[PDB]
Design a protein around this nucleic acid. Structure first.
Ligand SMILES: [Cl-]
Ligand SMILES: [Cl-]
Ligand SMILES: [K+]
Ligand SMILES: [Mg+2]
Ligand SMILES: [Mg+2]
Ligand SMILES: [Mg+2]
Ligand SMILES: [Mg+2]
Ligand SMILES: [Mg+2]
Ligand SMILES: [Mg+2]
Ligand SMILES: [Mg+2]
Ligand SMILES: [Mg+2]
Ligand SMILES: [Mg+2]
Ligand SMILES: [Mg+2]
Ligand code: NA
Ligand code: NA
Ligand code: NA
Ligand code: NA
Ligand code: NA
Ligand code: NA
Ligand code: NA
Ligand code: NA
Ligand code: NA
Ligand code: NA
Ligand code: NA
Lengths: 46, 81, 119, 65, 194, 56
RNA sequence: CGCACGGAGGCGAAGAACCACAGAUUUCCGAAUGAGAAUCUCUAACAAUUGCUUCGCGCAAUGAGGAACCCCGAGAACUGAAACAUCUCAGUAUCGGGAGGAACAGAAAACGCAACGUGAUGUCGUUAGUAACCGCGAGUGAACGCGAUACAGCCCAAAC
RNA sequence: AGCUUUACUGCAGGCUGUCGCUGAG
């Protein structure tokens, strides 16, 4: 498929959102990303 | 108002282009053309830009690979910052 | 057009308008259909003017027959702004009436006669 | 902090613009050093550099430049 | 004495007789070739227009509108319906043609507001009404003690809410007594039974 | 050919996409109309009374 | 130095944090309005429809939203009648158009306790399940008046 | 509920008269 510049930005963001909760936030809050998406198991929009 | 140059894209591959091809890589604003990236660079570093190659990265930012003239030396330029 | 039963020769219309101009400066005139209509009804009308380029025509249709059953003479004018101008207005005028001319009583008289003859 | 409101207002239009371009450059070089993962940072200032620029720009607006 | 206007009025009491008759037989020929909404420089029925609020002034507009004659243009049911609700031919709309005309006009002039309207005849298949509209934003009107009322915000889209004269009549609000139990203060507050 | 699993294999066509107006993945890229907000069909936002219980 | 209690660092007696009012900034798409487009792109823009008009987009208007309420239009069926067609469900559900902080109504071609009487309009209580409707079946169903709330009365067309 | 028909009742549609558009001898 041929992705446009806008689609690319969105995919880009989705990839970034697909990261973990940094270790320090765990400490800073005396102690989970409910939006973890797998390329295979999940399905993005568009 | 948005600025053209965001910051230097420093990575191993960026170094090779710098040490071996007199090229500097930058993260630039995605609304910037090669020509604008060229000027901005010459102005911010006082050098002569020969060629500019761009790429819209999977990071949401636009990457520019800028080649300097033989007069200038990428390594030396990158060092002052 | 529907209320017009006879064509007034350009020259005649010229004379008529002339008399009108002197009528305002020497005697008295009424400008506007409402005022004209009241002259014919009150009898104080000597000669009434009606434009032929009026739209809607209902505005004037009643003049012809009204004037007849009052003996009051009437003449047609092609333009509407020409009659309005003659009466001395900056705007046009659908109809006007010479309420007692002035140093034109002679002319008006002949014009009234010239028209009767024009049937 | 290091730069105050008065000091900015006591400047001349041309002094603010010059000070602006200065700050921008410092900012750009702070970001560059961060791009290289350079640790000689001082996180408190890169944060300040942005507020300063905001202030200078804000005053230019107020002063009609 | 009679006003000149009274003659226009007296002629329109019988649009099928006299000069007016010949006038209509002629105009309608041009009318049938004009469009749905035609702005006109002067009211065809001066007495009526002025009587309804008209004024030779800036911001006062007039447009003739033609609407088809007859009952509702209805589509037969495409699902189950009891005999009572299976009609098509005899169903008529609850809004009269004059009201349809006032609305089509107002939509043509989005910035204007309907002041009133009056009939100017009909041929075998359509009716024409002349609608008087007002520019609520023109200072010539904002400063007119007789019309500035139509400038208030609550007069926006008045025709679409039936605040027009033909609207209120069609809403059965004419009578103030017997027969208006389900009409005043509004059809909707009365459960829509008017 | 079974209308089930075997007919699921040809489904590689893109229709509903992220909508420029409402952000929902309902913009039919072939019809150029959003099934959710009406973008491309209506200037007004798509909305119906049946989207909730009658007395609410 | 947000939720957010880490690490590093910073800001605050030049009175910060924080709160109130006011102002600055305010990307792209979006009524979306130069044109096109799944939020991007292409070469000056009130697109479109109107009013005024210096007849030039010069000055203006409209568009879309909003919890429901409000006004004007379109308008079912399940159901009840122990079947069912009128009737009923119901002018309900749902649909089209539109206003405002409230809408709508409103100063009698009224009422008609018939009077030597009342006196704009909403609304509340009542009048009353009365009058009236109805395969005179099932069902449907007011008003005048009265007691209250709140009160407010005016402008044109024409004559001259 | 789908279907049928000289089942009951209706509704589109076609045909036809009449009125309007519609006038002169
Ligand atoms: Cl309106
Ligand atoms: Cl009483
Ligand atoms: K039923
Ligand atoms: Mg990654
Ligand atoms: Mg490329
Ligand atoms: Mg199947
Ligand atoms: Mg656009
Ligand atoms: Mg039953
Ligand atoms: Mg109400
Ligand atoms: Mg029974
Ligand atoms: Mg009922
Ligand atoms: Mg009563
Ligand atoms: Mg059955
Ligand atoms: Na996937
Ligand atoms: Na970056
Ligand atoms: Na309008
Ligand atoms: Na009724
Ligand atoms: Na803001
Ligand atoms: Na505009
Ligand atoms: Na213009
Ligand atoms: Na039953
Ligand atoms: Na049954
Ligand atoms: Na019944
Ligand atoms: Na079946």
């Amino acid at each position: 498929g041929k992705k446009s510049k806008a689609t690319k930005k969105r995919l880009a963001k989705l990839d970034n959102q697909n990261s973990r909760v940094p270790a320090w936030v765990m400490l800073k809050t005396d102690r989970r990303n409910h939006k973890r998406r797998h390329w295979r198991r999940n399905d993005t929009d568009e | 108002s948005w600025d053209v140059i965001k910051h230097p894209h420093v990575t191993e591959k960026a170094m090779n282009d710098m040490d071996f091809q007199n090229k500097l890589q930058f993260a630039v604003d995605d609304r910037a053309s090669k020509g604008e990236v060229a000027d901005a660079v010459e102005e911010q570093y006082d050098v002569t830009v020969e060629q500019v190659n761009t790429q819209n990265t999977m990071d949401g930012e636009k990457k520019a690979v800028v080649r300097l003239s033989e007069d200038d030396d990428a390594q030396e330029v990158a060092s002052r910052i | 057009p529907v209320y017009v039963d006879f064509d007034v020769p350009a020259d005649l219309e010229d004379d008529a308008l002339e008399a009108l101009e002197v009528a305002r400066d020497t005697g008295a005139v009424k400008k506007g259909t409402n005022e004209t209509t009241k002259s014919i009804e009150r009898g104080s009308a000597e000669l009434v003017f009606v434009a032929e380029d009026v739209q809607p025509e209902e505005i004037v249709m009643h003049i012809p027959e009204l004037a007849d059953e009052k003996g009051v003479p009437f003449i047609f004018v092609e333009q509407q702004d020409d009659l309005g101008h003659a009466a001395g207005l900056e705007v046009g005028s659908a109809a006007a009436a010479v309420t007692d001319a002035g140093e034109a009583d002679a002319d008006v008289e002949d014009i009234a006669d010239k028209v009767e003859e024009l049937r | 902090t290091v730069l105050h409101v008065q000091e900015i207002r006591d400047m001349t239009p041309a002094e603010r613009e010059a000070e602006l371009d200065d700050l921008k450059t410092e900012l750009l070089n702070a970001r560059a050093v961060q791009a290289a993962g350079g640790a000689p940072e001082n996180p408190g200032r890169i944060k300040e550099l942005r507020k300063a620029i905001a202030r200078i720009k804000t005053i230019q607006g107020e002063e009609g430049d | 004495a009679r006003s000149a206007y009274s003659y226009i009025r007296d002629a329109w009491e019988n649009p099928g007789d006299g000069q007016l008759a010949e006038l209509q037989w002629q105009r309608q020929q041009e009318w049938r070739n004009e469009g749905a909404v035609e702005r006109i420089e002067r009211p065809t029925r001066l007495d009526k227009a002025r009587s309804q609020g008209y004024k030779a002034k800036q911001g006062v507009i007039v447009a003739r509108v033609s609407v088809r004659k007859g009952s509702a243009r209805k589509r037969r049911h495409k699902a189950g319906r009891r005999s009572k609700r299976q009609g098509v031919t005899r169903i008529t709309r609850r809004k009269d043609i004059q009201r349809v005309a006032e609305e089509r006009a107002s939509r043509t002039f989005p910035n204007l507001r309907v002041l009133n309207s009056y009939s100017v005849g009909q041929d075998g298949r359509q009716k024409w009404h002349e609608v008087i509209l007002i520019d609520p934003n023109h200072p010539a009107i904002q400063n007119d003690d007789d019309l500035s009322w139509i400038c208030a915000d609550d007069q926006a889209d008045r025709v679409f809410r039936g605040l027009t004269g033909a609207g209120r009549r069609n809403r059965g609000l004419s009578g103030k007594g017997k027969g208006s139990e389900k009409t005043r203060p509004s059809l909707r507050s009365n459960g829509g039974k008017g | 050919t079974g209308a089930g699993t075997p007919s699921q294999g040809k489904k590689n066509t893109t229709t509903h996409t992220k909508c420029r107006r409402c952000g929902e993945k309902s913009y039919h890229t072939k019809k150029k109309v959003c099934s959710s907000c009406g973008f491309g069909k209506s200037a007004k936002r798509r909305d119906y009374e049946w989207q909730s219980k009658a007395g609410e």
